[PDB]
Amino acid sequence: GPLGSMENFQKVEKIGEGTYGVVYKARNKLTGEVVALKKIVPSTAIREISLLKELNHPNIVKLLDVIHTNKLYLVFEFLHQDLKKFMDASALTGIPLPLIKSYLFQLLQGLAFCHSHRVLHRDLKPQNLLINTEGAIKLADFGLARAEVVTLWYRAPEILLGCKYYSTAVDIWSLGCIFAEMVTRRALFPGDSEIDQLFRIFRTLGTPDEVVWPGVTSMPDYKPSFPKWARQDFSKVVPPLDEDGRSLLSQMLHYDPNKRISAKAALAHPFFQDVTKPVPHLRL
Numbered sequence: 001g002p003l004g005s006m007e008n009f010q011k012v013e014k015i016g017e018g019t020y021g022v023v024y025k026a027r028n029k030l031t032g033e034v035v036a037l038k039k040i041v042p043s044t045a046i047r048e049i050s051l052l053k054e055l056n057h058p059n060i061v062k063l064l065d066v067i068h069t070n071k072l073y074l075v076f077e078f079l080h081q082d083l084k085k086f087m088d089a090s091a092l093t094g095i096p097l098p099l100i101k102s103y104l105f106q107l108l109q110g111l112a113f114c115h116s117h118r119v120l121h122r123d124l125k126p127q128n129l130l131i132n133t134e135g136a137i138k139l140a141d142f143g144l145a146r147a148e149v150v151t152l153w154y155r156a157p158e159i160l161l162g163c164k165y166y167s168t169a170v171d172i173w174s175l176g177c178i179f180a181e182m183v184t185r186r187a188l189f190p191g192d193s194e195i196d197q198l199f200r201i202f203r204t205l206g207t208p209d210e211v212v213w214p215g216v217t218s219m220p221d222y223k224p225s226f227p228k229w230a231r232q233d234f235s236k237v238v239p240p241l242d243e244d245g246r247s248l249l250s251q252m253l254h255y256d257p258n259k260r261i262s263a264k265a266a267l268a269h270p271f272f273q274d275v276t277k278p279v280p281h282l283r284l
């Protein structure tokens, strides 16, 4: 790419770096706006990101600009905290349920929007769910169809079993995993290898078979030698979540992508009958 087109940005600080790339806080030297800068060119990707520029929703971190100068910079609306840090800060008391429920409701709204345009996130985790002082939560760093050890903790089972053409249901799984983690203050399935991840899922939800998941035994990475564990009861998995919450979570964690609840159906679940939008206690 050419030169000088990032001149208009002053790096304020490195936020972090990982498999995604590098993320900075920066100020536009001419408009004064404070933004997040992601540093990473294919055309398969250039038109994929351009689609995301048009994918605007109050629960999606706005993509402001895309700048190619051996580097691709994406410019994002800046947010002051992520859900992981807020979870850790909240660990002694827990996030109050009404806040958990608001955050879950909002992310399902954002996902419902993305999914209605057939856009998948693919890599939801607490670290890319961004929050502000007003009680909003937003989806960040959408994963591309092509594209510091990647975590598997939120990866859906069909991905782990070798599905090549997976669906929006993978985001519902990831979010159910995050929901459970907000409630219990412990990761649900903290696998440290692909098989440890699969087997942690199997040990809680039961080893899947053709009864609960038609087609599972023909999946590319399925092996008949998989151990057969019995399912645990949910009341043991996420206490003290109430029965509405457990019901919704059970549907977000169905093995069969065709049974897993959609984002739109989840919004209608009775768990949200009393949803509100509380203010978080954020110390910045």
Ligand SMILES: CNC(=O)c1ccc(-c2ccc(F)c(C(=O)Nc3c[nH]nc3C(=O)N[C@H]3CC[C@@H](N)CC3)c2F)cc1
Binding pocket: 015, 016, 018, 020, 021, 023, 035, 036, 037, 038, 061, 074, 076, 077, 078, 079, 080, 081, 082, 085, 125, 127, 128, 130, 140, 141
């Ligand atoms: C262990 N780490 C991870 O797994 C992980 C870590 C970062 C990412 C990631 C990758 C590419 C991105 F474009 C974005 C992104 O869009 N970021 C933002 C957009 N607007 N504001 C921000 C922002 O980062 N704000 C900070 C949040 C809390 C800080 N305390 C202070 C400000 C992103 F967040 C993905 C995974």
